[PDB]
């Protein structure tokens, strides 16, 4: 069913709730024992947002190899997300660790440091190029390279160091900074210009590892972005662009991590993300 009219359906029905909350009960159950060992606890967010143990990122280290992040395989789209939240004041050392091994090229963050008078992540990368970042306990240094500042997002440059082997890689942070502090954004517009910014740099691509991508939680904006980036690929590759069902692309992402689309809110925004977006894909 061409998503468009089941959208109009759902509007003029008013069924947001009932649908998402179908979702929520289809939606796959895995365990996650190793986010809940107790040495583990200062290395999450939230006590009710974890990693299952098949899909969770693993640290190259024999200490402790744990972070609060999962890998979303899409097997027909051809694409790989990392999700993960964002970063603690006693991981972020862990998080460039993770870019570095998974050999990641992007970073999208969805989320400002503070909102709604809180903390929602650590300030994990240098703000003057002459005050670079060292950490210490992962053996890296992070540089400003360069800071491109525009209405609705900023793309930065920056250089991450092994301290190691002195290699040295171009890593480029794509930072959303408009999604309101409460509800969604009105118009799909601004988002789906920032998804075609990620996607020109190659970030996404797969000559690089995994884009890493974050929110506060890692499941809300987050799994709305990699929601949005895969319906439109299956659409653009496929025979019949009507086939592709939203709902479906969802329960197969939400089995690698558990909750993506935290409110009936974040469903409809990525439905009018996507109608939106295909009427460029189409040809336009
Ligand atoms: O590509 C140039 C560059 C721009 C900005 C930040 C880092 C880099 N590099 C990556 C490759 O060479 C070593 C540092």
Not at 79 to 85: E, K, M
Not at 129 to 154: C, V
């Amino acid at each position: 069913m061409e998503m468009e009219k089941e959208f109009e359906q759902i509007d003029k029905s008013g069924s947001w709730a009932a649908i998402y909350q179908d979702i929520r009960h289809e939606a796959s159950d895995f365990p996650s024992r190793v986010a809940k060992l107790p040495k583990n606890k200062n290395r999450n967010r939230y006590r009710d947002v974890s990693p299952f143990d098949h899909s969770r990122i693993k640290l190259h280290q024999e200490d402790n190899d744990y972070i609060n992040a999962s890998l979303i395989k899409m097997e027909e789209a051809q694409r790989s997300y990392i999700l993960t939240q964002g970063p603690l004041p006693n991981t972020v050392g862990h998080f460039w660790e993770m870019v570095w091994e998974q050999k990641s090229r992007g970073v999208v963050m969805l989320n400002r440091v503070m909102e709604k008078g809180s903390l929602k992540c650590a300030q994990y990368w240098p703000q003057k190029e002459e005050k670079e970042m060292i950490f210490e306990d992962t053996n890296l240094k992070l540089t400003l390279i360069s800071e491109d500042i525009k209405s609705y997002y900023t793309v930065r440059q920056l250089e991450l160091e092994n301290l190691t082997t002195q290699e040295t890689r171009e890593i480029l942070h794509f930072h959303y900074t408009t999604w309101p502090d409460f509800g969604v954004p009105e118009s799909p517009a601004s988002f789906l210009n920032f998804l075609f910014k990620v996607r020109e740099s190659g970030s996404l691509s797969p000559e690089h590892g995994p884009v890493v991508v974050h929110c506060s939680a890692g499941i809300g904006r987050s799994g709305t972005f990699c929601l949005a980036d895969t319906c439109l690929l299956l659409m653009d590759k496929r025979k019949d662009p009507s086939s592709v069902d939203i709902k479906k692309v969802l329960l197969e992402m939400r089995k690698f991590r558990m909750g993506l689309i935290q409110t009936a809110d974040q469903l409809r925004f990525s439905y009018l993300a996507v109608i939106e977006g295909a009427k460029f894909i189409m040809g336009d």
